[PDB]
Design a protein around this ligand. Structure first.
Ligand SMILES: [Cl-]
Ligand SMILES: [Cl-]
Ligand SMILES: [Cl-]
Ligand SMILES: [Cl-]
Ligand SMILES: [Fe+3]
Ligand SMILES: [Fe+3]
Ligand SMILES: [Fe+3]
Ligand SMILES: [Fe+3]
Ligand SMILES: [Fe+3]
Ligand SMILES: [Fe+3]
Ligand SMILES: [Fe+3]
Ligand SMILES: [Fe+3]
Ligand SMILES: [Fe+3]
Lengths: 178, 178, 178, 178
């Protein structure tokens, strides 16, 4: 039995470029987390309590995704390399602008997973494509959800009255089309 | 065993300037109470039933704070001196103006506690600083809450439709960021 | 009513040096979080599942502390400034060495809070000292706990059999003196 | 409607090389089963009752996997061909050596599935890749688990006291990192 780079027994070696791609993706999830924390704060500063609660939960969920990836590297007997984390964006001129950045962050998270997925396919790493499949499914749902929240905020057309109604929807847990 | 100014057994003497400061602060709490009663009436006169219910409860809570301070003076064997109470402000041109006065009243209540706190520190009265600590913590929460309600009302920008939505939030008990 | 730096109604201005100190402390809590994540991974790589579960939970708790501080700045109408986060330490020669770093991290977190506390006292910011008081109390308990875990691991004197017994204690939730 | 090789109605023909690969993989699962039975006996002979119970259950699970594959061939209207089964390895010099063989058996089971998966992809048999996807996911978890058990036994460094502690973990159902 061979030992993997993290010292555990190795079921199958992993291409170093694929390993680097996964370590980088963990940073993307962690950056999404702190970005949603920054968004939760921006909303709290403007008394948008439902949006604050929504993004507070999204920040925790993205961190959970990051940890889920670290556990996969452990399972593959590969080293983790937790990286320096950039500061998030913290300033927006409007809730519509913030929601556009949130949607982009979600789509960019999927693009990062897709990049890892393609590298795994090039290397015939079927464990990794199988690991990523449910995460892509979750990304479809999250993109659908963020397109819903962004679209509803844009429909409001900057009317504070409409944004208060939507804020109350989010506080109530009404966060997707259903 | 020595007897304190109110006749009870005295654990430790209190500086007369600190005692006067606490008696004055009791008046501040009582004045906050009648101010919130006046605000509850102003809101009721304009059919803002959620704001009326909110300020009706705040009036009762501030009175409870006043009584809590009278009990501390009893516990310290100090005399209470219940004072003449000024009439509250009763007229405002808008809900936003009323909410600004409410926020100021809350911040001024904290400033009064801070003034007592500093005098207790000058006199090394650790019983009094310990007594005030949880009241300052409650003031942080109340200032946060009143900044939330004021900010949400200002966001409404005088639109009656938005103010009705917020009024319904308050009637439902949705009175802070959460 | 004045507006604070984050745009909310301002109960009382905050010294900019104190604000910077709190923003820096938020980074300390976030760094403790990712440090405990790195420790959880190191333990998982060596099949120390109880230590892995313990540090996984500590990472989540430190993040919660960070968010708790961001909420205080919101409550004080002060700006948050989420900072670049350094990469954590990730390599240790032994569990005893890891636990020494964990204890130091906990003590250093308290030192950071103490530094903020002293600055608040210099500025007579009683809201901030009151806010920090329960966090210092929690730090006493955490230092006591980490001294317990470190001391028990050192008592084991590197015997794998003893470290397995302690690992099972932690998996069972037996993480302090009680 | 065409009839498949096993006589049932045929939804889509299967490449004979892919069919042979699946029939061979069924033998791999059955061989893993009898290997884990042999390991359970070796552990029982040495009073390692927790390891005996663990491998007794693994033997039953691998047989279930084999039957799951036979049901897929039925579903595809393909013939099953149950093969002669080799005798398992039955002798080991130590528990650490046994656990290394167990880990290798698990990794080799995954390699067999990967071989079938690649053949299905070459033949554009999407039913088969979809069928195998959750089995690969289960293999990741099993490899992670067996790396955990092997690593913990190796950490024990042959100390009977440590092996008794681990044996009791397994009897209690504590068989993975969690
Ligand atoms: Cl907007
Ligand atoms: Cl108004
Ligand atoms: Cl050690
Ligand atoms: Cl052994
Ligand atoms: Fe994510
Ligand atoms: Fe996401
Ligand atoms: Fe009060
Ligand atoms: Fe008050
Ligand atoms: Fe902390
Ligand atoms: Fe801590
Ligand atoms: Fe199997
Ligand atoms: Fe298996
Ligand atoms: Fe799938």
């Amino acid at each position: 039995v061979a030992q993997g780079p993290n010292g555990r027994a190795l079921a199958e070696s992993m291409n170093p470029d694929l390993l680097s791609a996964i370590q980088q993706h963990i940073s993307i999830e962690r950056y999404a987390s702190v970005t949603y924390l920054a968004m939760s704060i921006w909303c709290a500063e403007r008394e948008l309590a439902g949006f604050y609660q929504f993004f507070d939960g999204e920040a925790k969920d993205e961190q959970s995704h990051a940890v889920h990836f670290t556990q996969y590297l452990i399972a593959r007997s590969q080293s983790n390399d937790l990286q320096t984390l950039d500061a998030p964006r913290q300033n927006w001129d409007s809730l519509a602008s913030l929601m556009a950045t949130a949607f982009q962050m979600e789509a960019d998270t999927t693009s990062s997973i897709q990049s890892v997925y393609a590298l795994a396919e090039r290397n015939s790493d079927t464990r990794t494509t199988v690991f990523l499949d449910p995460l892509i499914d979750a990304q479809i749902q999250s993109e659908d959800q963020f397109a819903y929240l962004l679209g509803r905020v844009k429909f409001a057309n900057g009317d504070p009255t409409a944004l208060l109604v939507i804020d109350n929807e989010l506080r109530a847990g009404q966060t997707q089309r259903g």
